[PDB]
Subunit: 474 residues, 2 copies
């Protein structure tokens, strides 16, 4: 039994009573939070190592409820300015295709480096490139080494959407030299591939890695395919996830909303996590609420791609589990939970013309405990409580931007930039300490970033994509 | 300890599990439901009297969450076609003024007759005519005799709204021969009068009568007045109630919504029941939700007076306690919970373009258990559960309109007219049996109705109100 003691911190527990514990400590053992206490009232147990958190804030690790990792190598100029499908077919698919396994490994490490730096400890990777050979293995090796907690949601597409062909062909003419790609696969092939992947990797890296099935959308997946995924999630006590209504061209499947359609086939349940709820109406919300569907809101990305604004307050006010996702590494274009929290707070205040539509406490909940709920993992993660995993982060507010600070949630949401996280523990392991990354040490950092830059450039050459378009004011 | 056994009925319990118990019985003692059972599994206890409910449906008594009784003598021609304030100042105030105590007694008995006939067992009387001498006394005598459960919410006005004077003078010119009335009173006078009324009548008639304070509106009552009412409710373990935002001329007090205004002064709490939520926005709903404010929706009246349509589904979807009120006897113009339930179901389906916005089950809950909640009385009434008061109603569905019937809530909401109620018990006492009213026997009924007709006619003469306006198609 390895042990760790975090001492003299202010504990923002996000526990049942939302306790905030001044000058207090956390005892960790074998990856689990085993006890907590107040220093004035109790003495911490002896431990192999002590981390002094004096003058620091301790939080549960942030949870990235829905993201796409590999695409991070496509940010920096190629990705912006485009509506969802334009982005998807002229950038994302062709760019992903051009990526070799050694490229994917770098992307994953880069993504993880930025994520951990910003306090993110759990990542729901929606993987659209798992169809390409060697990619999975390359990625999983890095996830495991790095020590992050990962849900690997293996996306599949088993159905052509014939309605949208002419639209796509027209979009492709924008970059006619980038190649029109298809990642469709037969239903049975997808089942086999995902089942294999689950059998092999689910529970690996010390319980840190999970595998879920991810039918892509209601228009790109058959009923048979979604029913399988639903059944799979139930049989294996995990979740399934689906992208739902992310553009106005998806808004309507068979004369009804995607939620309506899913309801018709008995496809809304408590183990479903839907992502992207922009094109939702009152009824869609009601249906999701009725069946206890979990939600991931990609607020920044919904803006970036010009989709719009989801009805998060409406869902939250009904006690639904809504987490925050950064979305793609190239539809954001950061991996920074704090920046996105700020954005979640502000965009909804602005649109509702209501300064109190979401409290910063609530936003912080979305990033932590509620996010865990949306992953069906709230029993294991999301709060500083005895029994739960030691996924913990230490923030230093001793900086200009976060001075003064009194109310910690307000300070974090409205002031912090994302560089104030100091130490990060995942499953009891020290992944980052005084901003030094265990899986990317400072003496190796600059060289690694140069490798990532190069590979990115090369990827874009191979895909025939324009990296740096001409200066454009309008 | 007197006893009553209701047998061989189908029990629609509205209990914690929404149990519907076929061929089942209820045992009543000293006004309280002491046991329930299924006939096939168990034998009912011996009892002084048995009521055979064979082929009948047993429900908790309907709860009229917000109403105004006396005005019932002003229905039948004088009251319709007018916006809220036009109705208020040219019909309601002058008409009420013209009523003598002997008239009020008749009004109350007529109202109660109709109410009990339609299954209503609890009544939240918002009394705007309590200021006139002898009226309280007359009314209370009848409520007590009749055996209905009554909340007597004594309304007061201690503040002139100078902003709407010109509007009202213009409205008065519609019926210039009808006198402009004021029922304003000094803050201290109102406190004293209400406190006296409470001391005298609260808990009387075997616990069946309660007294609450009812500041009329946020524009017609001082902050000092509302705070007093709030404190009073707290100190005496009752509720306080307030009319909120019933017309577009109210929709703003001091540059903010009434709910916003109340929030500013700490005036929203869990003992508050607001009525009339038509001019409500998302933020108002949120505020009421935050503080667990109870609500009464007067759906039919909101239509009758041309106010509009309240966001009931939005409040209900947030688990708020929303009851159904019939409102004024002369802004409906019935006292029929079943008819109003039907209207609640349909108006919202039509406006939301959604056939399932409110299930008939949910509508039925609004009329019973949820209604009880909205009165702060859900521990005592609203469901067929052991420990609760024996406020119970028997419905006979053996009629053409309610045939066929399978799903009982659907049948009651979408088919029943309101004449299907047979036997009614309030606090264990039999108040109607086989449509015979204990407090208005059939051999006396016709003569009583002729007395009510006469007195009504006379009231209108005295108030100089037009009873029967000329035929008008446009
Ligand atoms: Fe996405
Ligand atoms: Fe009213």
């Amino acid at each position: 039994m390895q042990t760790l003691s975090i001492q003299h911190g202010t504990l923002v527990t996000m526990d049942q009573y939302r306790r905030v514990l001044g000058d207090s400590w956390v005892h960790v053992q074998d990856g689990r939070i085993v006890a907590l206490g107040v220093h004035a009232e109790s003495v911490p147990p002896p431990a192999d190592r002590v981390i002094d958190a004096r003058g620091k804030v301790v939080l549960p690790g942030f949870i990235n409820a829905h993201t796409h990792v590999n695409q991070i190598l496509l940010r920096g100029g190629p990705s912006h300015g485009r509506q969802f499908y334009d982005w998807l077919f002229n950038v994302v698919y062709p760019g992903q295709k051009a990526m070799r396994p050694e490229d994917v490994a770098v992307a994953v490490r880069l993504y993880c480096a930025e994520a951990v730096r910003s306090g993110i400890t759990t990542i729901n990777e929606n993987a659209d490139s798992a169809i390409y050979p060697g990619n999975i293995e390359a990625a999983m090796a890095v996830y495991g080494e790095v020590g992050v907690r990962v849900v690997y949601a293996r996306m599949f597409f088993d159905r052509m959407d014939g309605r949208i062909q002419g639209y796509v062909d027209a979009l492709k003419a924008r970059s006619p030299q980038v190649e029109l790609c298809s990642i469709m696969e037969e239903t049975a092939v997808a089942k086999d591939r995902i089942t294999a992947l689950s059998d092999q990797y689910h529970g690996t890296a010390g319980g840190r890695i999970s595998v879920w099935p991810a039918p892509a959308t209601t228009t790109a997946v058959t009923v048979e395919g979604m029913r399988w995924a639903q059944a799979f999630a139930r049989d294996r006590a995990v979740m399934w996830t689906l992208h739902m209504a992310e553009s106005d061209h998806d808004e309507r499947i068979h004369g009804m909303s995607p939620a309506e359609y899913m309801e018709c086939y008995g496809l809304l349940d408590e183990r479903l996590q839907v992502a992207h709820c922009v094109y939702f109406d009152r009824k869609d919300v009601r249906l999701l609420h009725r069946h206890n569907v979990k939600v991931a809101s990609q607020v920044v990305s919904n803006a970036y791609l010009g989709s719009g604004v989801a009805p998060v307050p409406e869902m939250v006010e009904r006690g639904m589990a809504v987490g925050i996702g950064t979305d793609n590494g190239n539809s954001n274009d950061s991996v920074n939970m704090i920046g996105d929290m700020k954005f979640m707070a502000h965009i909804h205040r602005a649109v509702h013309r209501d300064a109190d539509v979401l409290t910063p406490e609530k936003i912080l909940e979305m990033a932590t405990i509620d996010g865990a709920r949306s992953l069906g993992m709230d029993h294991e993660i999301g709060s500083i409580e005895t029994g739960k995993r030691a996924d913990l982060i230490l923030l230093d507010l001793r900086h200009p931007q976060t001075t003064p600070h009194h109310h910690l949630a307000a300070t974090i949401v409205f002031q912090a930039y994302g560089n104030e996280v100091d130490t990060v523990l995942i499953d009891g392991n020290v992944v980052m300490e005084n901003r030094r990354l265990s899986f990317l040490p400072p003496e190796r950092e600059l060289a690694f970033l140069e490798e990532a830059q190069s590979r990115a450039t090369a990827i874009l050459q191979r895909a025939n994509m324009v990296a740096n378009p001409a200066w454009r004011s309008l």
